[PDB]
Design a protein around this ligand. Structure first.
Ligand code: CHL
Ligand code: CLA
Ligand code: CLA
Ligand code: CLA
Ligand code: CLA
Ligand code: CLA
Ligand code: CLA
Ligand code: CLA
Ligand SMILES: CCCCCCCCCCCCCCCC(=O)OC[C@H](COP(=O)(O)OC[C@@H](O)CO)OC(=O)CCCCCCCCCCCCCCC
Ligand SMILES: CC(/C=C/C=C(C)/C=C/[C@@]12O[C@]1(C)C[C@@H](O)CC2(C)C)=C\C=C\C=C(C)\C=C\C=C(C)\C=C\[C@@]12O[C@]1(C)C[C@@H](O)CC2(C)C
Lengths: 166, 149, 41, 196
């Protein structure tokens, strides 16, 4: 669990997927707040997972680093409005229906294990995106793959001493 | 911020020279060995040492020839405001903690109002030493929840 | 006597003694470290 | 039970069950029973760390003086260069000490909460009083009787005093810790704090 020896909040019993009893600020007391936060976390995880390879692949393929419009605005506004139109609390977190033609929802236990795996990978991808954003600030104009190569030059340490103490 | 150091302030030098010249004007009125002249001669040296010390500490003078104080937190001027501030805070906390601890001790008596006029010196002398560790005492009491009624 | 101690512990006399000692001390530092504007330590 | 000042009654909150008790509390800092536990743990940790520091900053000076090795004093060790930058070593220390310190803090809050290994589930420490982990930390399996605890606390207090003395020695005289002792023994009645 989040850190052993700490009592968990009453609203986090360890039954929810990806739950580890983490709430040092207690921002999820109200049930409606918890449902909204669950949905928001799922959306963030999915977007970050979809985005990270789209940033990395350019540099690997040598096309460059990560550093029409009306159609895009219309499509995104329509998609988000249509998603917002849904009313069921359960269907918003997982819409199912025809969106999963491969039929991976047949097995319940496998479904729950997949849910836990997806949540964990989403947290990892979100942390990776934060890492990318902070990395760009320290070394302007340098992509993450070049930073990895420079680390491979000196595989000793995360070079924060060169930055934290100039 | 457009300020110059004391040691390179022509107006500072002019102020020192003018004060010395004014002081020496009254020295000529008395005999050199007389007591008023001896007392006056001790004033000139005090002025000279004060000006030398002000120049030696890196104080900043403006166009007036008068030192200015910088309290924005610069590490080169921590002696102007930051260093004396912590000392005052420590002393005031000592006084407040002693005063608060005396009242609590006598609150349980049958007539606590009588001890506020005729101070119990043997009881007060014991509490006085306890104010030395007031920061730790207050930090521990805040966590336990006994600070606020 | 006991009355002598009791009269000496009354608020005005004790306050006057404390403030006199305080003023003497403050004059002592002001004489020992005259014309002070910054901490040289 | 020892008394730190004959003719003075000991405070009531010091029942004498704790190790290294002498009824010494003129300021009454441990009036609240909760504060007593935290203060006890802080005293233990400070004693152990001060003991290690005093030993490690006194012995090499003696070794250099006798002639076995050639090592500078304790205060100037920072000027020497090492195989890694000081910032790098600080980064290793900062990450590394966080784990152990958080583990100890978790034990202090809930006793016996962190006794189980988090990676391998079959290894754990035996139950014991807080502040004395035992187990793997006591490989030779010495008896943790009250006498040994009293010895540890006395040595820790002496080490605290010695460390403060060393710091004040360097601040005023500006010489080495062991150099001062030899200077004192040459003319005991002419080389003292009075002269300096
Ligand atoms: C506790 C502690 C004490 C008493 C000192 C003693 C001192 N260290 Mg220090 N250090 C301490 C922690 C640590 N030091 C260092 C590594 C260094 C270095 C590299 C330097 C010091 C320096 C200093 C001086 C800063 C003023 C002072 C004499 C400086 C010095 O020796 O200048 C006189 C200096 O350059 N220390 C590390 C490892 C990260 C510490 C933990
Ligand atoms: C914006 C992204 C986002 C959102 C909406 C959530 C939302 C949530 N997380 Mg979460 N999380 C995230 C990113 C996010 N997380 C990341 C990046 C990590 C990795 C560091 C985690 C790691 C994590 C753990 C370990 C746990 C949660 C948990 C939770 C749930 C309860 C906590 C809460 O109410 O705080 C929501 C707080 C906010 C929305 C405030 C936003 C920030 C402000 C400055 C809630 C649904 C707990 C839970 O119920 O498990 C499922 C739990 O145990 N999260
Ligand atoms: C929502 C996710 C997302 C977003 C916003 C973008 C956005 C962008 N991508 Mg991209 N990409 C993504 C996912 C994403 N990508 C994924 C998953 C892959 C893997 C197939 C790629 C592979 C890819 C390549 C190979 C290239 C881009 C490029 C670009 C940039 C403009 C040209 C283009 O291809 O149109 C946008 C394309 C898809 C949205 C644009 C900033 C180009 C670039 O470097 O321009 C700066 C480019 O050469 N992308
Ligand atoms: C150039 C070398 C280098 C390398 C290889 C990395 C690598 C990484 N950084 Mg990073 N970082 C660097 C320099 C570097 N950083 C510098 C110079 C800074 C400025 C202080 C940061 C500030 C930074 C932040 C603030 C964060 C990262 C994070 C991360 C990790 C992303 C998530 C993760 O754990 O992936 C696997 C990743 C391992 C993120 C993380 O969670 O790290 C564990 C994160 O939040 N980095
Ligand atoms: C940081 C060091 C440290 C700490 C945390 C403690 C803590 C403690 N000591 Mg202790 N002690 C120390 C150093 C320390 N000692 C040293 C160096 C000596 C040798 C003189 C002693 C000698 C001693 C005796 C003889 C006794 C104790 C006792 C105690 C316990 C009750 C007193 C109390 O409330 O302490 C509160 C203490 C603090 C909040 C720390 C004081 C704050 C700083 C250090 C003040 C610095 C002032 C200084 C002039 C500079 C308590 C756990 C008594 C006991 O029953 O033990 C179980 C007892 O009888 N101690
Ligand atoms: C606790 C403690 C701490 C923080 C240190 C820290 C240090 N010791 Mg050290 N030491 C200790 C205990 C400790 N010692 C004990 C208990 C003994 C016995 C020694 C015997 C010892 C020797 C013999 C030497 C050090 C040296 C050093 C310094 C560089 C070596 C290093 O850290 O790697 C470093 C400041 C070295 C040094 O000062 O040269 C750079 C060195 O030659 N130590
Ligand atoms: C002279 C000082 C001194 C003394 C008397 C003790 C005594 C004790 N320590 Mg100990 N300890 C010390 C310094 C000391 N320690 C220091 C400096 C550290 C930090 C490195 C520790 C870290 C430590 C841990 C982590 C643990 C103990 C434990 C113990 C107890 C059982 C081990 C034992 O008998 O060791 C006897 C030691 C000697 C006879 C020293 C011989 C000389 C050597 C060079 C015992 C009361 C254990 C305990 O109480 O749990 C049961 C335990 O888990 N100690
Ligand atoms: C048990 C610890 C201990 C021991 C063995 C010594 C031993 C010594 N100290 Mg010393 N000292 C200590 C603690 C200790 N000190 C502490 C805690 C402080 C901080 C207040 C000082 C501050 C200090 C100064 C400022 C000087 C010495 C000096 C000396 C040396 C000459 C003797 C002297 O003048 O006594 C001085 C003793 C005191 C001032 C009283 C300290 C309290 C006692 C030791 C408590 C233990 C009983 C001698 C080797 C002198 C030196 O350099 O020698 C050439 C010197 O000038 N010490
Ligand atoms: C560790 C020491 C404490 C650190 C945190 C100190 C601040 C208190 C916690 C704030 C954490 C927090 O989010 O508190 C949220 C809390 C309550 O907010 P609401 O009632 O709007 O929402 C409550 C729901 O989020 C519960 O699920 O206070 C506020 O409204 C914000 C107050 C500061 C507003 C600043 C910006 C103003 C413009
Ligand atoms: C831990 C400690 C020392 C730690 C030192 C270390 C690690 C040294 C390390 C180094 O050497 C090496 C390793 C390398 C050196 O090159 C590098 C350094 C870093 C220099 C000191 C504690 C030092 C702590 C001290 C001295 C505390 C004294 C406290 C006292 C006396 C309290 C008295 C009271 O508390 C009681 C007693 C009763 C209360 O009620 C009321 C009163 C009366 C007030």
């Amino acid at each position: 669990h989040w850190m052993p020896g700490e009592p968990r909040p009453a609203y986090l019993d360890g039954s929810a997927p990806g739950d580890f009893g983490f709430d040092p600020l207690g921002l999820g007391e109200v049930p409606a707040n918890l449902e909204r936060y669950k949905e928001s976390e799922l959306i963030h995880c999915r977007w970050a997972m979809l985005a990270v390879p789209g940033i990395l692949v350019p540099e690997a393929l040598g096309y460059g680093n990560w550093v029409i419009l009306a159609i895009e605005f219309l499509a995104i506004a329509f998609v988000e409005h249509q998603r917002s139109m849904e009313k069921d609390p359960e269907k918003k977190k997982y819409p199912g229906g025809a969106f999963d033609p491969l039929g991976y929802s047949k097995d319940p236990k496998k479904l729950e294990e997949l849910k836990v795996k997806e949540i964990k990978n989403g947290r990892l991808a979100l942390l990776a995106f934060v890492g990318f954003c902070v990395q760009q600030s320290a070394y302007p104009g340098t992509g993450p793959l070049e930073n990895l190569a420079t680390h491979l030059a000196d595989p000793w340490h995360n070079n924060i001493g060169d930055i934290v103490i100039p | 911020s457009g300020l110059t150091p004391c040691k390179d302030s022509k107006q500072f030098a002019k102020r020192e020279k003018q004060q010395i010249k004014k002081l020496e004007s009254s020295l000529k009125l008395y005999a050199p060995e007389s007591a008023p002249a001896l007392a006056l001669n001790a004033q000139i040296e005090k002025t000279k040492r004060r000006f030398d010390n002000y120049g030696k500490y890196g104080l900043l003078c403006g166009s007036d020839g008068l030192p200015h104080l910088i309290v924005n937190g610069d590490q080169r001027h921590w002696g102007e405001f930051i260093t004396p501030g912590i000392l005052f805070l420590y002393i005031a906390g000592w006084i407040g903690w002693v005063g608060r601890s005396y009242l609590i001790a006598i609150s349980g008596e049958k007539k606590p109002a009588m001890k506020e006029i005729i101070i119990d010196v043997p009881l007060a002398s014991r509490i006085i030493f306890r104010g030395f560790i007031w920061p730790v005492a207050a930090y521990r009491e805040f966590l336990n929840g006994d600070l606020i009624a | 006597m006991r009355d002598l101690k009791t009269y000496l512990s009354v608020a005005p006399v004790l306050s006057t003694l404390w403030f006199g000692s305080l003023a003497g001390l403050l004059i002592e530092i002001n004489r020992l470290f005259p014309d002070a504007l910054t901490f040289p330590f | 039970k020892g008394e730190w000042l004959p003719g003075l009654a000991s405070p009531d909150y010091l029942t004498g069950s704790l190790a290294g008790d002498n009824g010494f509390d003129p300021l009454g800092l441990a009036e609240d029973p909760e504060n007593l536990k935290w203060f006890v743990q802080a005293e233990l940790v400070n004693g152990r760390w001060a003991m290690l520091g005093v030993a490690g900053m006194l012995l090499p000076e003696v070794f250099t003086k006798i002639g076995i090795i050639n090592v500078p004093e304790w205060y100037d060790a920072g000027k020497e260069q090492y195989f890694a930058s000081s910032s790098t070593l600080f980064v290793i220390e900062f990450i590394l000490f966080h784990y152990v310190e958080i583990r100890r803090w978790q034990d202090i809050k809930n006793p016996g909460s962190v006794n189980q290994d988090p990676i391998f589930k079959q290894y754990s420490l035996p139950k014991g009083e807080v502040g004395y982990p035992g187990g793997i930390f006591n490989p030779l399996n010495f008896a943790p009787t009250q006498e040994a605890k009293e010895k540890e606390l006395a040595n820790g207090r002496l080490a605290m005093l010695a460390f403060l003395g060393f710091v004040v020695q360097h601040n005023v005289t500006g010489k080495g810790p062991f150099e001062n002792l030899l200077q004192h023994l040459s003319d005991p009645w002419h080389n003292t704090i009075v002269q300096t």
